[PDB]
């Protein structure tokens, strides 16, 4: 009755992510060209190389989020304290929002997945998008 909207995105993402997330990366590291500087965010492919697992987790959660239907897997698992715990390490905000935005961007119906599929899809991006901020 309304699972099949989200169903459908889930298992879309599930299907194909690493192709999303890496997506996600380059775009990310042009917004700010800046990070691969010395001695910045992902300076060295070892930092960059991590950072990429970070989109992986957070796009990690969403497929979690819309089968159990709400963002409850990605909250507790990323939500809170995994943003003031970047603070500690210098990991800026604006760098994590920079993959979102061109992930929620680059959506299609007819040729991604659907109509009430992708609006959810961004739902749960924004989701992010906002509790980043
Ligand atoms: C409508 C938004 C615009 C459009 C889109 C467009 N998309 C691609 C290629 C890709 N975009 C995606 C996005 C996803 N793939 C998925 O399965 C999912 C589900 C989580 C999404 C949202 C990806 C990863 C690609 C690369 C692989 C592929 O071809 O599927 C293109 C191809 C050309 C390009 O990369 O720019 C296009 C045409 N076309 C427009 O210009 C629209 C306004
Ligand atoms: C591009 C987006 C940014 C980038 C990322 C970056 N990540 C880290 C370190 C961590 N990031 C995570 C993220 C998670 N770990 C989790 O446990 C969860 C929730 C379950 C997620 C999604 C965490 C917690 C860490 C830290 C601790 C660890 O080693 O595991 C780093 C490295 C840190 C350092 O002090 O060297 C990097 C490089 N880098 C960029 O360029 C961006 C701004």
């Known amino acids: 009755q309304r699972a099949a909207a989200r169903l ?3 298992e879309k993402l599930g299907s194909n ?21 010395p001695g910045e965010a992902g300076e060295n492919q070892e930092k960059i190389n991590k950072c990429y697992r970070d989109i992986d987790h957070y796009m990690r959660l969403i497929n979690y989020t819309l089968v159990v239907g709400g963002t409850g897997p990605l909250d507790e698992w990323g939500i809170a304290g995994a943003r003031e715990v970047y603070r500690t390490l210098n990991l800026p905000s604006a760098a994590y929002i920079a993959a979102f935005v061109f992930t929620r961007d680059r959506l299609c119906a007819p040729r991604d997945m659907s109509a009430q599929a992708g609006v959810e899809f961004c739902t749960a991006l924004d989701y992010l998008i906002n509790s980043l901020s």
């Open 17 to 37: 992510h690493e192709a999303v997330v890496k997506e996600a990366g380059d775009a990310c590291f042009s917004k700010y060209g800046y990070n691969k500087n």
């Open 8 to 10: 459908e995105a889930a």
